[PDB]
Amino acid sequence: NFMLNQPHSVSESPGKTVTISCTRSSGNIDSNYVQWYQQRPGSAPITVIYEDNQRPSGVPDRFAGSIDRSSNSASLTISGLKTEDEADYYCQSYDARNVVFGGGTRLTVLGQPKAAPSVTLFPPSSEELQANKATLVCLISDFYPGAVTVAWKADSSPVKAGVETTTPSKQSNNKYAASSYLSLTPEQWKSHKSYSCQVTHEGSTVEKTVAPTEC
Amino acid sequence: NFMLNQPHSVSESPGKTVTISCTRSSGNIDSNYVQWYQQRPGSAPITVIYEDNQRPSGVPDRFAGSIDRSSNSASLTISGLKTEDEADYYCQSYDARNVVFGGGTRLTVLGQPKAAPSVTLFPPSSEELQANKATLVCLISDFYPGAVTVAWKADSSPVKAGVETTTPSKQSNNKYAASSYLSLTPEQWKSHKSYSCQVTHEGSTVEKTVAPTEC
Ligand SMILES: CCN(CC)c1ccc2c(C)c(CCOC(=O)NCc3cccc(-c4cnc[nH]4)c3)c(=O)oc2c1
């Protein structure tokens, strides 16, 4: 039960080349066969590569799979980008028994200029505390492409439980907005020195921190 | 070069049994293993059946796979149907020359109960005021069905500029979440006694109010 690690997102303009990596965690990449699946928004998945570099019939020559043994990774390289190439791409391999999927990479064929997110982190409101709630909100607006990943820290430990993040939506300025909220009890919020929201967009990561003591 | 044919959609009410078929166009259904995947929109898919009828751990035993050699099909049967089973389901098999997916079945669970939204209004953070911004966020969560309308007030008067509301998205609890944010200047925020966010859902309105606080 090993892991395959893919970038969360990639972008390029029409006619360019883009590459999506898939790094094996503990194992030997050439030990087992890697597949690549395309999923366009609102569509069924489609095999574009099997057995590391084989193209199914009807998949164009612009899709190419490869293996790097020294880096222990698989790559999908797409040349001559077209707007229809915009989709989620997932790598997949095998152990002695086990099937392992990568977490997926969103490929945007740029339809507008790139824009980095505005990120604002809010501490609990006085009113929700009296309701025994210490929900923190991380507002993420004015970004393009519409792909972000959010990670929360309690002090400096990753927080797993309590996190929700909305699907990015296009706003009146034609850029995306989303919010992530962490549903703390007041006891959990007071019991730490600070909490942090990390937002990754186009592989650039920003971090904001709030604390019970900040006046 | 065979195809797998599943219904586009199916609907059923809670506690009932639903069946999703997957018909192989050419060759025998039993010549290659069939997998079933569940996918909630915004999320990556999960494996619910492999090798025709094997369940990974963490998959409820309410999920069962089978083969019918005579109708040349595979079936996913979900018994004791629950709201969280609402999702897209894909079958998948092998061509030796390809990995083949069905077209996907969107399963609708009927008769989900109305749920009123939780509404939390956050005043500007100290850090954004120091960067000359006074954005308010109104976090709206746990509502069903997935539509609200938001109106903002400055003192008692309607706000007509600077409001954005995200498109509601279904969260892990199968209820919807959205944020409305009002992009104020520090001057606008301090020149009023309060701002209010008013959320309407299925005829009921909830109103929350925040005021500049003297730190
Ligand atoms: C769109 C492409 N696609 C096909 C529907 C994906 C795309 C991504 C995924 C991911 C990330 C997971 C979660 C991680 O799953 C795994 O690593 N393995 C799944 C699994 C678990 C147990 C048994 C099997 C299995 C399948 N055949 C034999 N054994 C597979 C997953 O389970 O399924 C995925 C399917």
Tab-separated table of C-alpha atoms and ligand atoms in Angstrom:
chain	number	residue	atom	x	y	z
A	1	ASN	CA	0.000	0.000	0.000
A	2	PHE	CA	2.557	2.621	-1.299
A	3	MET	CA	1.736	6.167	-2.648
A	4	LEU	CA	1.934	7.918	-6.077
A	5	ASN	CA	2.424	11.712	-5.693
A	6	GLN	CA	1.107	14.090	-8.456
A	7	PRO	CA	1.159	17.946	-8.552
A	8	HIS	CA	-2.340	19.360	-7.647
A	9	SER	CA	-2.459	21.454	-10.893
A	10	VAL	CA	-0.684	22.602	-14.108
A	11	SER	CA	-1.594	25.216	-16.762
A	12	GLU	CA	-0.381	26.362	-20.181
A	13	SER	CA	-1.727	28.255	-23.219
A	14	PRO	CA	-3.048	26.596	-26.426
A	15	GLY	CA	-0.320	24.976	-28.632
A	16	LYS	CA	2.210	24.610	-25.756
A	17	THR	CA	3.644	21.468	-24.069
A	18	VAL	CA	2.891	20.469	-20.445
A	19	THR	CA	4.183	17.566	-18.304
A	20	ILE	CA	2.421	15.914	-15.302
A	21	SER	CA	4.638	13.856	-12.914
A	22	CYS	CA	3.716	10.849	-10.724
A	23	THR	CA	6.415	9.933	-8.123
A	24	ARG	CA	6.328	6.452	-6.517
A	25	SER	CA	6.827	6.716	-2.680
A	26	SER	CA	8.364	3.431	-1.453
A	27	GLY	CA	8.854	0.988	-4.370
A	28	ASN	CA	10.585	0.697	-7.798
A	29	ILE	CA	8.717	2.641	-10.601
A	30	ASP	CA	9.778	0.234	-13.450
A	31	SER	CA	8.751	-2.709	-11.154
A	32	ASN	CA	5.026	-2.313	-12.227
A	33	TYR	CA	2.908	-0.793	-15.082
A	34	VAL	CA	1.533	2.816	-14.915
A	35	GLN	CA	-1.813	3.900	-16.513
A	36	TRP	CA	-3.048	7.522	-17.073
A	37	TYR	CA	-6.753	8.497	-17.070
A	38	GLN	CA	-8.217	11.784	-18.396
A	39	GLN	CA	-11.501	13.045	-16.850
A	40	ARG	CA	-13.020	16.183	-18.468
A	41	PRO	CA	-15.389	18.145	-16.176
A	42	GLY	CA	-18.792	16.319	-16.096
A	43	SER	CA	-17.418	13.300	-18.123
A	44	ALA	CA	-16.481	9.632	-17.645
A	45	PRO	CA	-12.772	8.777	-17.348
A	46	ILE	CA	-10.870	7.795	-20.554
A	47	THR	CA	-7.569	5.876	-20.768
A	48	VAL	CA	-4.936	7.976	-22.612
A	49	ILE	CA	-1.904	5.761	-21.564
A	50	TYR	CA	-1.532	2.111	-20.389
A	51	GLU	CA	1.639	0.016	-19.623
A	52	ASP	CA	3.735	3.208	-19.114
A	53	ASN	CA	3.713	4.404	-22.767
A	54	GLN	CA	1.015	2.523	-24.822
A	55	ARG	CA	-1.691	4.704	-26.459
A	56	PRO	CA	-5.177	3.183	-26.981
A	57	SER	CA	-6.478	3.508	-30.554
A	58	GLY	CA	-8.019	6.978	-31.132
A	59	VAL	CA	-5.635	8.663	-28.600
A	60	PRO	CA	-3.460	11.167	-30.539
A	61	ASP	CA	0.342	11.108	-30.779
A	62	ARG	CA	0.466	14.387	-28.709
A	63	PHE	CA	-0.103	12.242	-25.511
A	64	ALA	CA	3.128	10.489	-24.401
A	65	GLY	CA	3.874	8.413	-21.286
A	66	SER	CA	7.434	7.864	-19.968
A	67	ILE	CA	9.300	6.473	-16.919
A	68	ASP	CA	12.300	8.057	-15.089
A	69	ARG	CA	14.023	5.339	-13.014
A	70	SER	CA	16.639	7.696	-11.385
A	71	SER	CA	13.753	9.992	-10.111
A	72	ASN	CA	11.486	6.872	-9.539
A	73	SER	CA	8.564	8.606	-11.402
A	74	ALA	CA	6.127	8.306	-14.377
A	75	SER	CA	5.213	11.350	-16.593
A	76	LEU	CA	2.385	12.197	-19.021
A	77	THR	CA	3.570	14.826	-21.556
A	78	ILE	CA	0.911	16.559	-23.718
A	79	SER	CA	2.211	18.525	-26.800
A	80	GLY	CA	0.217	20.974	-28.932
A	81	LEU	CA	-2.315	21.690	-26.107
A	82	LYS	CA	-5.953	22.103	-27.219
A	83	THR	CA	-8.876	23.468	-25.117
A	84	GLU	CA	-10.421	19.907	-25.031
A	85	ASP	CA	-7.234	18.696	-23.098
A	86	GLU	CA	-8.532	20.621	-20.000
A	87	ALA	CA	-9.343	17.858	-17.411
A	88	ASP	CA	-8.168	15.956	-14.303
A	89	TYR	CA	-5.321	13.452	-15.047
A	90	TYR	CA	-4.694	10.493	-12.639
A	91	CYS	CA	-1.684	8.043	-12.700
A	92	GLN	CA	-2.143	4.434	-11.359
A	93	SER	CA	0.133	1.361	-10.619
A	94	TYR	CA	0.376	-1.944	-8.621
A	95	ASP	CA	2.182	-3.753	-5.766
A	96	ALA	CA	2.441	-7.572	-5.290
A	97	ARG	CA	-1.412	-7.409	-4.672
A	98	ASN	CA	-2.318	-3.642	-4.344
A	99	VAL	CA	-3.776	-1.017	-6.787
A	100	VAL	CA	-2.575	2.580	-5.967
A	101	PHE	CA	-3.970	5.804	-7.607
A	102	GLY	CA	-2.358	9.264	-7.610
A	103	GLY	CA	-4.521	12.083	-6.167
A	104	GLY	CA	-5.057	13.727	-9.581
A	105	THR	CA	-3.704	16.832	-11.379
A	106	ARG	CA	-6.093	19.505	-12.784
A	107	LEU	CA	-4.811	20.786	-16.211
A	108	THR	CA	-6.158	24.252	-17.187
A	109	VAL	CA	-5.663	25.457	-20.755
A	110	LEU	CA	-5.376	29.175	-19.851
A	111	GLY	CA	-8.561	31.049	-20.890
A	112	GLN	CA	-7.532	34.323	-19.162
A	113	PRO	CA	-4.487	35.782	-17.334
A	114	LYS	CA	-3.264	33.964	-14.195
A	115	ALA	CA	-4.228	35.748	-10.900
A	116	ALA	CA	-2.919	34.806	-7.388
A	117	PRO	CA	-5.572	34.466	-4.631
A	118	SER	CA	-6.400	37.095	-1.993
A	119	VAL	CA	-6.307	35.052	1.291
A	120	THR	CA	-7.958	36.381	4.543
A	121	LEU	CA	-8.087	34.310	7.773
A	122	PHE	CA	-10.783	35.204	10.373
A	123	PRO	CA	-10.699	34.261	14.113
A	124	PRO	CA	-13.946	33.178	15.858
A	125	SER	CA	-16.771	35.784	16.160
A	126	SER	CA	-17.942	36.750	19.739
A	127	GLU	CA	-21.469	35.532	18.864
A	128	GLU	CA	-20.458	31.957	17.766
A	129	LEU	CA	-18.280	31.506	20.918
A	130	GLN	CA	-21.431	32.008	23.114
A	131	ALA	CA	-22.939	29.153	20.984
A	132	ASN	CA	-19.874	26.923	21.939
A	133	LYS	CA	-18.396	27.290	18.357
A	134	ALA	CA	-14.923	28.500	17.346
A	135	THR	CA	-15.199	27.975	13.549
A	136	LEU	CA	-12.328	29.740	11.676
A	137	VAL	CA	-12.937	30.944	8.033
A	138	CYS	CA	-10.240	31.257	5.341
A	139	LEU	CA	-11.582	33.392	2.406
A	140	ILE	CA	-9.768	32.820	-0.963
A	141	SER	CA	-10.889	35.206	-3.781
A	142	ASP	CA	-9.800	36.704	-7.138
A	143	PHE	CA	-7.786	33.640	-8.425
A	144	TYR	CA	-7.231	31.968	-11.833
A	145	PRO	CA	-6.988	29.109	-12.664
A	146	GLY	CA	-9.822	27.845	-10.341
A	147	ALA	CA	-7.627	25.098	-8.672
A	148	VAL	CA	-6.375	25.509	-5.011
A	149	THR	CA	-5.406	23.185	-2.178
A	150	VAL	CA	-5.869	24.243	1.475
A	151	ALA	CA	-4.022	22.816	4.520
A	152	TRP	CA	-4.731	23.832	8.172
A	153	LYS	CA	-2.184	23.799	11.083
A	154	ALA	CA	-2.956	23.613	14.855
A	155	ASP	CA	0.246	25.336	16.153
A	156	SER	CA	2.447	23.530	13.519
A	157	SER	CA	0.812	20.012	13.415
A	158	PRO	CA	-1.370	19.296	10.364
A	159	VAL	CA	-5.121	19.346	11.296
A	160	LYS	CA	-7.084	16.447	9.694
A	161	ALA	CA	-10.597	16.631	11.224
A	162	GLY	CA	-13.087	19.535	10.989
A	163	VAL	CA	-11.961	20.922	7.567
A	164	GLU	CA	-14.442	21.784	4.798
A	165	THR	CA	-13.512	23.637	1.536
A	166	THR	CA	-16.038	24.867	-1.073
A	167	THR	CA	-15.731	24.171	-4.801
A	168	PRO	CA	-14.252	27.310	-6.386
A	169	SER	CA	-16.919	29.373	-8.245
A	170	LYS	CA	-16.588	32.175	-10.836
A	171	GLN	CA	-17.597	35.577	-9.338
A	172	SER	CA	-18.722	38.897	-10.990
A	173	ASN	CA	-15.068	39.834	-11.979
A	174	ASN	CA	-14.742	36.423	-13.834
A	175	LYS	CA	-12.151	35.151	-11.257
A	176	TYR	CA	-12.744	32.355	-8.710
A	177	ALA	CA	-13.590	32.466	-4.953
A	178	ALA	CA	-13.829	29.740	-2.275
A	179	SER	CA	-13.702	29.483	1.517
A	180	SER	CA	-12.283	26.799	3.827
A	181	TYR	CA	-13.658	26.554	7.404
A	182	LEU	CA	-12.271	24.595	10.417
A	183	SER	CA	-15.059	23.756	12.945
A	184	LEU	CA	-13.190	24.091	16.324
A	185	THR	CA	-14.870	23.973	19.764
A	186	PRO	CA	-13.864	26.950	21.955
A	187	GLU	CA	-11.827	24.510	24.173
A	188	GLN	CA	-9.718	23.433	21.092
A	189	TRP	CA	-9.235	27.110	19.976
A	190	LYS	CA	-8.009	28.309	23.449
A	191	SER	CA	-5.882	25.110	23.900
A	192	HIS	CA	-3.334	26.237	21.159
A	193	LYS	CA	-1.102	29.336	20.602
A	194	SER	CA	-2.258	29.824	16.923
A	195	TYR	CA	-4.000	28.207	13.902
A	196	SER	CA	-2.879	28.604	10.249
A	197	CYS	CA	-4.518	28.244	6.770
A	198	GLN	CA	-2.094	27.432	3.899
A	199	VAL	CA	-3.354	28.019	0.331
A	200	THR	CA	-1.384	26.540	-2.629
A	201	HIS	CA	-2.214	27.943	-6.137
A	202	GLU	CA	-0.030	27.158	-9.219
A	203	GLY	CA	2.546	25.560	-6.810
A	204	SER	CA	2.960	28.972	-4.979
A	205	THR	CA	1.921	28.575	-1.255
A	206	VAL	CA	0.707	31.419	1.035
A	207	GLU	CA	0.024	31.049	4.800
A	208	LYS	CA	-2.046	33.217	7.247
A	209	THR	CA	-2.139	32.770	11.079
A	210	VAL	CA	-4.627	33.816	13.831
A	211	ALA	CA	-4.282	33.465	17.659
A	212	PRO	CA	-6.635	33.774	20.696
A	213	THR	CA	-4.139	36.531	21.873
A	214	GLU	CA	-3.592	39.203	19.083
A	215	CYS	CA	-4.421	42.612	20.796
B	1	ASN	CA	-12.407	-2.458	-28.815
B	2	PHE	CA	-15.599	-3.253	-26.695
B	3	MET	CA	-17.678	-0.664	-24.753
B	4	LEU	CA	-19.470	-0.785	-21.353
B	5	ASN	CA	-23.032	0.592	-21.281
B	6	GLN	CA	-24.585	1.814	-17.997
B	7	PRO	CA	-27.733	3.908	-17.451
B	8	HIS	CA	-27.087	7.729	-17.442
B	9	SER	CA	-29.161	8.041	-14.232
B	10	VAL	CA	-31.199	6.133	-11.591
B	11	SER	CA	-33.260	7.387	-8.555
B	12	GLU	CA	-34.426	5.608	-5.375
B	13	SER	CA	-35.631	6.570	-1.838
B	14	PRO	CA	-33.792	5.810	1.444
B	15	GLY	CA	-33.667	2.242	2.867
B	16	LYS	CA	-34.568	0.838	-0.612
B	17	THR	CA	-32.332	-1.334	-2.870
B	18	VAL	CA	-30.956	0.112	-6.162
B	19	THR	CA	-29.229	-1.821	-8.961
B	20	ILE	CA	-26.845	-0.353	-11.621
B	21	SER	CA	-26.061	-2.538	-14.698
B	22	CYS	CA	-22.961	-2.477	-16.919
B	23	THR	CA	-23.429	-4.272	-20.308
B	24	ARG	CA	-20.308	-5.380	-22.326
B	25	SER	CA	-20.899	-4.733	-26.106
B	26	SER	CA	-18.554	-7.472	-27.466
B	27	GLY	CA	-16.771	-10.443	-25.822
B	28	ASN	CA	-17.902	-12.246	-22.635
B	29	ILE	CA	-18.385	-10.216	-19.405
B	30	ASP	CA	-16.590	-13.065	-17.518
B	31	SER	CA	-13.332	-12.928	-19.657
B	32	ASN	CA	-12.000	-9.929	-17.569
B	33	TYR	CA	-12.509	-8.547	-14.028
B	34	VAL	CA	-15.013	-5.669	-13.410
B	35	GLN	CA	-14.308	-2.813	-10.913
B	36	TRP	CA	-16.840	-0.209	-9.615
B	37	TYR	CA	-15.868	3.371	-8.623
B	38	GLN	CA	-17.918	5.964	-6.673
B	39	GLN	CA	-17.228	9.708	-7.281
B	40	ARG	CA	-18.708	12.710	-5.444
B	41	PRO	CA	-18.320	15.848	-7.643
B	42	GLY	CA	-15.310	18.035	-6.684
B	43	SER	CA	-13.645	14.878	-5.198
B	44	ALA	CA	-11.496	12.090	-6.690
B	45	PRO	CA	-13.162	8.647	-7.076
B	46	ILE	CA	-13.053	5.743	-4.551
B	47	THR	CA	-12.948	1.961	-5.398
B	48	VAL	CA	-16.125	0.227	-4.012
B	49	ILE	CA	-15.773	-3.195	-5.838
B	50	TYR	CA	-12.776	-4.939	-7.490
B	51	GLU	CA	-12.572	-8.444	-9.126
B	52	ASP	CA	-16.402	-8.486	-9.783
B	53	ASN	CA	-17.475	-8.757	-6.081
B	54	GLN	CA	-14.565	-7.942	-3.624
B	55	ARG	CA	-15.049	-4.911	-1.249
B	56	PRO	CA	-12.020	-2.865	-0.113
B	57	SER	CA	-11.927	-2.109	3.670
B	58	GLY	CA	-13.988	0.929	4.717
B	59	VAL	CA	-16.585	0.141	2.000
B	60	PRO	CA	-19.990	-0.539	3.606
B	61	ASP	CA	-21.190	-4.182	3.145
B	62	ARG	CA	-24.425	-2.584	1.698
B	63	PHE	CA	-22.387	-2.426	-1.612
B	64	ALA	CA	-22.371	-5.703	-3.656
B	65	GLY	CA	-21.047	-6.579	-7.130
B	66	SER	CA	-22.207	-9.477	-9.312
B	67	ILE	CA	-21.938	-10.871	-12.888
B	68	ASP	CA	-24.818	-12.156	-15.073
B	69	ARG	CA	-23.124	-14.128	-17.921
B	70	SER	CA	-26.433	-14.507	-19.891
B	71	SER	CA	-27.396	-10.742	-20.040
B	72	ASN	CA	-23.564	-10.285	-20.511
B	73	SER	CA	-23.502	-7.650	-17.734
B	74	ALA	CA	-22.079	-6.697	-14.319
B	75	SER	CA	-24.226	-5.074	-11.574
B	76	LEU	CA	-23.594	-2.896	-8.516
B	77	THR	CA	-26.417	-3.437	-5.963
B	78	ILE	CA	-26.705	-0.897	-3.114
B	79	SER	CA	-29.085	-2.006	-0.342
B	80	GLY	CA	-30.368	0.050	2.627
B	81	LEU	CA	-29.795	3.118	0.415
B	82	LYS	CA	-28.479	6.177	2.408
B	83	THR	CA	-28.203	9.910	1.429
B	84	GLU	CA	-24.340	9.773	1.336
B	85	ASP	CA	-24.642	7.133	-1.505
B	86	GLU	CA	-25.681	10.020	-3.874
B	87	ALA	CA	-22.725	10.034	-6.339
B	88	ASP	CA	-21.559	9.007	-9.842
B	89	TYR	CA	-20.749	5.244	-10.277
B	90	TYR	CA	-18.473	3.939	-13.094
B	91	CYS	CA	-17.845	0.311	-14.036
B	92	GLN	CA	-14.419	-0.542	-15.526
B	93	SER	CA	-12.899	-3.623	-17.262
B	94	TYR	CA	-9.927	-4.581	-19.543
B	95	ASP	CA	-9.384	-5.016	-23.356
B	96	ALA	CA	-5.692	-6.212	-22.992
B	97	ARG	CA	-5.246	-3.343	-25.538
B	98	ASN	CA	-7.030	-0.904	-23.065
B	99	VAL	CA	-8.702	-0.090	-19.704
B	100	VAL	CA	-12.407	0.529	-20.542
B	101	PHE	CA	-14.831	2.627	-18.419
B	102	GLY	CA	-18.620	2.781	-18.515
B	103	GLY	CA	-20.283	6.159	-19.218
B	104	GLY	CA	-21.230	6.614	-15.550
B	105	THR	CA	-24.545	6.416	-13.644
B	106	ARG	CA	-25.614	9.437	-11.552
B	107	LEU	CA	-27.564	8.002	-8.576
B	108	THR	CA	-30.136	10.420	-6.996
B	109	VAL	CA	-31.365	9.679	-3.449
B	110	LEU	CA	-34.982	10.990	-3.241
B	111	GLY	CA	-36.696	12.700	-0.276
B	112	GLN	CA	-33.703	14.353	1.475
B	113	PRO	CA	-35.098	16.610	4.274
B	114	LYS	CA	-34.940	20.444	4.226
B	115	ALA	CA	-32.198	21.703	6.617
B	116	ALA	CA	-31.936	25.420	7.626
B	117	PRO	CA	-28.472	27.027	7.265
B	118	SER	CA	-26.015	27.789	10.083
B	119	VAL	CA	-24.986	31.487	9.559
B	120	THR	CA	-21.787	33.003	11.074
B	121	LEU	CA	-20.834	36.669	10.337
B	122	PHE	CA	-17.122	37.669	10.792
B	123	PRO	CA	-16.045	41.350	11.177
B	124	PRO	CA	-12.747	42.504	9.599
B	125	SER	CA	-9.572	40.864	11.022
B	126	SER	CA	-6.907	43.165	12.611
B	127	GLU	CA	-4.298	42.009	10.022
B	128	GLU	CA	-6.450	42.973	6.948
B	129	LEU	CA	-7.329	46.395	8.531
B	130	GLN	CA	-3.512	46.945	8.923
B	131	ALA	CA	-3.245	46.227	5.131
B	132	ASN	CA	-6.089	48.769	4.510
B	133	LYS	CA	-8.922	46.198	3.803
B	134	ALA	CA	-12.226	45.684	5.701
B	135	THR	CA	-13.731	42.552	4.035
B	136	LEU	CA	-16.629	40.905	6.006
B	137	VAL	CA	-17.424	37.156	5.488
B	138	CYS	CA	-20.862	35.507	6.141
B	139	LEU	CA	-20.300	31.697	6.303
B	140	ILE	CA	-23.476	29.751	5.407
B	141	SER	CA	-23.364	25.943	6.062
B	142	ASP	CA	-25.430	22.723	6.530
B	143	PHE	CA	-28.376	23.733	4.297
B	144	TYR	CA	-30.523	21.581	2.006
B	145	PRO	CA	-31.638	22.137	-0.675
B	146	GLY	CA	-28.635	23.941	-2.198
B	147	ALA	CA	-30.033	27.471	-2.909
B	148	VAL	CA	-29.992	30.672	-0.714
B	149	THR	CA	-30.317	34.425	-1.317
B	150	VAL	CA	-28.184	36.886	0.684
B	151	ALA	CA	-28.809	40.606	1.337
B	152	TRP	CA	-26.423	42.883	3.293
B	153	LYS	CA	-27.311	46.009	5.361
B	154	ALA	CA	-25.142	49.015	6.342
B	155	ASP	CA	-26.835	50.166	9.580
B	156	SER	CA	-30.489	49.558	8.495
B	157	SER	CA	-30.076	50.439	4.719
B	158	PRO	CA	-29.493	48.040	1.753
B	159	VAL	CA	-25.878	47.473	0.533
B	160	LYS	CA	-25.908	47.722	-3.325
B	161	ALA	CA	-22.092	47.452	-4.052
B	162	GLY	CA	-19.217	45.050	-3.210
B	163	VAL	CA	-21.213	41.796	-2.442
B	164	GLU	CA	-20.110	38.415	-3.882
B	165	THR	CA	-21.680	35.056	-2.951
B	166	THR	CA	-20.056	31.678	-3.872
B	167	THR	CA	-22.093	28.955	-5.673
B	168	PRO	CA	-23.265	26.499	-2.972
B	169	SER	CA	-21.237	23.243	-2.960
B	170	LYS	CA	-22.160	19.906	-1.270
B	171	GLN	CA	-19.795	19.187	1.706
B	172	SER	CA	-18.850	15.851	3.455
B	173	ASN	CA	-22.173	15.868	5.467
B	174	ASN	CA	-24.185	15.894	2.115
B	175	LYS	CA	-25.460	19.428	2.989
B	176	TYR	CA	-24.422	22.647	1.139
B	177	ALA	CA	-21.955	25.443	2.043
B	178	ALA	CA	-21.321	28.966	0.656
B	179	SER	CA	-19.733	32.258	1.814
B	180	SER	CA	-20.948	35.813	1.037
B	181	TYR	CA	-18.159	38.447	1.367
B	182	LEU	CA	-18.553	42.260	1.381
B	183	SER	CA	-15.366	44.073	0.237
B	184	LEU	CA	-15.407	47.324	2.315
B	185	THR	CA	-12.707	50.015	2.758
B	186	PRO	CA	-11.635	50.620	6.400
B	187	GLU	CA	-13.423	54.039	6.122
B	188	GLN	CA	-16.780	52.434	5.079
B	189	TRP	CA	-16.575	49.892	8.012
B	190	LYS	CA	-15.741	52.509	10.725
B	191	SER	CA	-18.335	55.093	9.416
B	192	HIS	CA	-21.354	52.811	10.189
B	193	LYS	CA	-22.665	51.544	13.561
B	194	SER	CA	-22.963	47.933	12.187
B	195	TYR	CA	-23.292	45.692	9.106
B	196	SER	CA	-25.757	42.756	8.777
B	197	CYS	CA	-25.918	39.651	6.568
B	198	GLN	CA	-29.490	38.352	5.903
B	199	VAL	CA	-29.816	34.747	4.560
B	200	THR	CA	-33.098	33.471	3.071
B	201	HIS	CA	-33.645	29.685	2.593
B	202	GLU	CA	-37.051	28.047	1.819
B	203	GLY	CA	-38.898	31.219	3.033
B	204	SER	CA	-37.105	31.533	6.468
B	205	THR	CA	-34.659	34.476	6.910
B	206	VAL	CA	-31.745	34.469	9.439
B	207	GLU	CA	-30.008	37.792	10.191
B	208	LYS	CA	-26.602	38.373	11.893
B	209	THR	CA	-25.028	41.755	12.832
B	210	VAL	CA	-21.413	42.845	13.641
B	211	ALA	CA	-20.030	46.223	14.786
B	212	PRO	CA	-16.556	47.824	14.965
B	213	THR	CA	-14.943	46.668	18.319
B	214	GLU	CA	-12.655	48.920	20.384
B	215	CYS	CA	-9.208	47.174	20.384
C	1	LIG	C1	-10.632	8.966	-12.835
C	1	LIG	C2	-9.675	7.838	-12.718
C	1	LIG	N1	-10.094	6.890	-11.621
C	1	LIG	C3	-10.950	5.786	-12.037
C	1	LIG	C4	-12.356	5.948	-11.560
C	1	LIG	C5	-9.631	7.031	-10.268
C	1	LIG	C6	-8.772	8.088	-9.900
C	1	LIG	C7	-8.250	8.183	-8.614
C	1	LIG	C8	-8.605	7.268	-7.620
C	1	LIG	C9	-8.171	7.378	-6.213
C	1	LIG	C10	-7.269	8.514	-5.816
C	1	LIG	C11	-8.623	6.427	-5.337
C	1	LIG	C12	-8.304	6.463	-3.868
C	1	LIG	C13	-6.977	5.758	-3.719
C	1	LIG	O1	-7.178	4.390	-4.141
C	1	LIG	C14	-6.087	3.579	-4.247
C	1	LIG	O2	-4.940	3.950	-4.184
C	1	LIG	N2	-6.457	2.321	-4.518
C	1	LIG	C15	-7.844	1.922	-4.710
C	1	LIG	C16	-8.070	0.463	-4.414
C	1	LIG	C17	-8.187	-0.005	-3.109
C	1	LIG	C18	-8.337	-1.356	-2.857
C	1	LIG	C19	-8.377	-2.253	-3.909
C	1	LIG	C20	-8.244	-1.805	-5.220
C	1	LIG	C21	-8.163	-2.756	-6.338
C	1	LIG	C22	-8.585	-2.602	-7.629
C	1	LIG	N3	-8.247	-3.750	-8.290
C	1	LIG	C23	-7.637	-4.552	-7.401
C	1	LIG	N4	-7.562	-3.996	-6.200
C	1	LIG	C24	-8.108	-0.443	-5.462
C	1	LIG	C25	-9.496	5.309	-5.783
C	1	LIG	O3	-9.838	4.352	-5.118
C	1	LIG	O4	-9.888	5.289	-7.096
C	1	LIG	C26	-9.462	6.222	-7.997
C	1	LIG	C27	-9.963	6.091	-9.284
